[PDB]
Enzyme design. Structure first.
Site, short mmCIF file in Angstrom:
data_model
loop_
_atom_site.label_atom_id
_atom_site.label_comp_id
_atom_site.label_asym_id
_atom_site.label_seq_id
_atom_site.Cartn_x
_atom_site.Cartn_y
_atom_site.Cartn_z
N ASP A 201 0.83 -1.20 0.00
CA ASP A 201 0.00 0.00 0.00
C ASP A 201 0.86 1.25 0.00
O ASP A 201 0.67 2.16 -0.82
CB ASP A 201 -0.92 0.02 1.22
CG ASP A 201 -1.87 -1.14 1.25
OD1 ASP A 201 -2.42 -1.50 0.18
OD2 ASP A 201 -2.04 -1.72 2.34
N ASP B 18 13.67 19.66 -4.45
CA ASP B 18 14.23 21.00 -4.66
C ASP B 18 15.64 21.16 -4.11
O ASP B 18 16.11 22.30 -3.95
CB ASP B 18 13.31 22.05 -4.04
CG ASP B 18 13.20 21.92 -2.54
OD1 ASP B 18 13.59 20.86 -2.02
OD2 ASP B 18 12.69 22.88 -1.90
N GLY B 19 16.36 20.07 -3.87
CA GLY B 19 17.68 20.19 -3.29
C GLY B 19 17.58 20.35 -1.79
O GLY B 19 16.53 20.11 -1.19
N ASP C 60 17.22 21.51 2.02
CA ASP C 60 16.22 22.33 2.71
C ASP C 60 15.02 22.60 1.81
O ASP C 60 14.78 21.86 0.86
CB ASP C 60 16.87 23.62 3.23
CG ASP C 60 18.02 23.35 4.20
OD1 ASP C 60 17.84 22.57 5.16
OD2 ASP C 60 19.13 23.90 3.98
N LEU D 249 11.47 22.10 0.68
CA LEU D 249 10.55 21.01 0.93
C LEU D 249 11.35 19.76 1.25
O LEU D 249 12.38 19.50 0.63
CB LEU D 249 9.61 20.83 -0.26
CG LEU D 249 10.11 20.31 -1.59
CD1 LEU D 249 10.06 18.80 -1.53
CD2 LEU D 249 9.24 20.82 -2.72
N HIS E 253 7.52 9.88 -0.08
CA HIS E 253 8.82 10.14 -0.70
C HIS E 253 9.61 11.13 0.14
O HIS E 253 9.06 12.13 0.62
CB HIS E 253 8.67 10.70 -2.11
CG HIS E 253 7.97 9.78 -3.05
ND1 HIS E 253 7.44 10.21 -4.24
CD2 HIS E 253 7.73 8.45 -2.98
CE1 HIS E 253 6.88 9.18 -4.86
NE2 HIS E 253 7.04 8.11 -4.12
N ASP F 160 16.32 13.10 -0.59
CA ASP F 160 17.63 12.67 -0.12
C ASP F 160 18.71 13.73 -0.33
O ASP F 160 19.88 13.46 -0.05
CB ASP F 160 18.04 11.35 -0.80
CG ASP F 160 18.89 10.46 0.11
OD1 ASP F 160 19.12 10.84 1.29
OD2 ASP F 160 19.32 9.38 -0.34
N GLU G 99 18.33 16.20 1.58
CA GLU G 99 18.42 16.51 3.00
C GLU G 99 19.41 15.59 3.69
O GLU G 99 19.64 14.47 3.26
CB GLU G 99 17.06 16.38 3.71
CG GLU G 99 15.89 17.00 2.98
CD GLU G 99 16.13 18.43 2.59
OE1 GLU G 99 16.98 19.11 3.22
OE2 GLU G 99 15.47 18.91 1.66
N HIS H 13 4.71 12.59 9.92
CA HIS H 13 3.88 13.56 9.22
C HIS H 13 3.42 13.03 7.87
O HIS H 13 2.22 13.05 7.56
CB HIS H 13 4.67 14.87 9.06
CG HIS H 13 3.99 15.88 8.20
ND1 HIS H 13 3.37 17.00 8.72
CD2 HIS H 13 3.84 15.94 6.86
CE1 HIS H 13 2.84 17.69 7.73
NE2 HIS H 13 3.12 17.08 6.59
N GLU H 14 4.36 12.57 7.03
CA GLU H 14 3.99 12.08 5.70
C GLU H 14 3.04 10.89 5.77
O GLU H 14 2.14 10.76 4.93
CB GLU H 14 5.25 11.70 4.93
CG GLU H 14 6.21 12.86 4.71
CD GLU H 14 5.56 14.04 4.04
OE1 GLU H 14 6.06 15.17 4.20
OE2 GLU H 14 4.57 13.87 3.31
N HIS I 157 -0.50 11.92 5.76
CA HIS I 157 -1.06 12.07 4.42
C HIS I 157 -1.40 10.72 3.81
O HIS I 157 -2.41 10.58 3.12
CB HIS I 157 -0.09 12.79 3.48
CG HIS I 157 0.16 14.23 3.84
ND1 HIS I 157 -0.85 15.16 3.98
CD2 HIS I 157 1.33 14.90 4.01
CE1 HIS I 157 -0.31 16.34 4.26
NE2 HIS I 157 1.00 16.20 4.29
N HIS J 128 -3.13 19.09 5.73
CA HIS J 128 -2.35 19.84 6.70
C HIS J 128 -3.27 20.47 7.74
O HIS J 128 -4.41 20.84 7.45
CB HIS J 128 -1.51 20.93 6.04
CG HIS J 128 -0.31 20.39 5.33
ND1 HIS J 128 0.20 20.97 4.18
CD2 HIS J 128 0.48 19.34 5.61
CE1 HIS J 128 1.25 20.27 3.78
NE2 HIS J 128 1.45 19.29 4.64
CA LIG Z 1 20.54 12.74 2.12
CA LIG Z 2 14.54 19.80 -0.17
CA LIG Z 3 0.64 2.99 -3.07
ZN LIG Z 4 2.46 17.57 4.68
ZN LIG Z 5 7.68 12.00 -5.14
#
Ligand SMILES: [Ca+2]
Ligand SMILES: [Ca+2]
Ligand SMILES: [Ca+2]
Ligand SMILES: [Zn+2]
Ligand SMILES: [Zn+2]
Length: 220
Positions: free
Chosen positions: A117, A134-135, A137, A139, A155, A158, A160, A178-179, A182, A188
């Site tokens: 799932d 976004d690289g 920091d 998001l 997801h 990486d 970070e 947190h994720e 969702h 949120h």
């Molecule tokens: Ca990393």
């Molecule tokens: Ca980021």
């Molecule tokens: Ca799935």
């Molecule tokens: Zn969120």
């Molecule tokens: Zn993704």
């Protein structure tokens, strides 16, 4: 500053719904003073690392009613960041699921197949779903509401530095908890202390708050 604001208000859904009116929507959604102005508190908020899921609206049209209709939820750790030992990553996700299993009728079981799932993936920039990271920091991660395929998946960026203690990087445990919210069907929260608030804040206290539990209970 106005360029950062334009990109933030666009990315997280405020511009579509609507700078004043969109800034007002953001200040309401984040529980900031509702000045309607690109002021210091709003800019500080926009510069705070946070979840990649939009605040108003959704990534896309999804299938179904956006909650799970079975209780044995499976998850697959598709790959691993090199920032943490495998066993530490495994345990971080296990603890994050344990938060939600105590307050729901759901169980979470680790599987080793794409059939899961909840498929958990580490990636960078464009990683296969058209919602690029976004690289470093900015998001930190995103996830998708319950349903088939990419739905339910989580997801993690990486670019970070993933960690667990106080110090450098970001708690994989807290972001995952947190994720996973969702991935179970939550949006949120506007309560700044709630787990489902979109901004990252490190804490050693219990992650769930009343608003998070209220939301998950409403669903299940
Ligand atoms: Ca990393
Ligand atoms: Ca980021
Ligand atoms: Ca799935
Ligand atoms: Zn969120
Ligand atoms: Zn993704």
């Amino acid at each position: 500053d106005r360029q950062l604001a334009e990109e933030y208000l666009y990315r997280y859904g405020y511009t579509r719904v609507a700078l004043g009116p969109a800034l007002l929507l953001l200040q309401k959604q984040l529980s900031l003073p509702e000045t309607g102005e690109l002021d210091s508190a709003t800019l500080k908020a926009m510069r705070t690392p946070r979840c990649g899921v939009p605040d108003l609206g959704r990534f896309q049209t999804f299938e179904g009613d956006l909650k799970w209709h079975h209780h044995n939820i499976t998850y697959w750790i598709q790959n691993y960041s090199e920032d943490l030992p495998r066993a530490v990553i495994d345990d971080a996700f296990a603890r994050a699921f344990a938060l939600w299993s105590a307050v729901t009728p759901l169980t979470f079981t680790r599987v080793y197949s794409r059939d899961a799932d909840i498929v958990i993936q580490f990636g960078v920039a464009e990683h296969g779903d058209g919602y690029p990271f976004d690289g470093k920091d900015g998001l930190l991660a995103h996830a998708f509401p319950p349903g088939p395929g990419i739905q339910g998946d989580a997801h993690f960026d990486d670019d970070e530095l993933w960690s667990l203690g106080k110090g450098q990087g970001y708690s994989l445990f807290l972001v995952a908890a947190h994720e996973f919210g969702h991935a179970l069907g939550l949006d949120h929260s506007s309560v700044p202390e709630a787990l489902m608030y979109p901004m990252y804040r490190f804490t050693e206290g219990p992650p769930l708050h009343k608003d998070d539990v209220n939301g998950i209970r409403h669903l299940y």
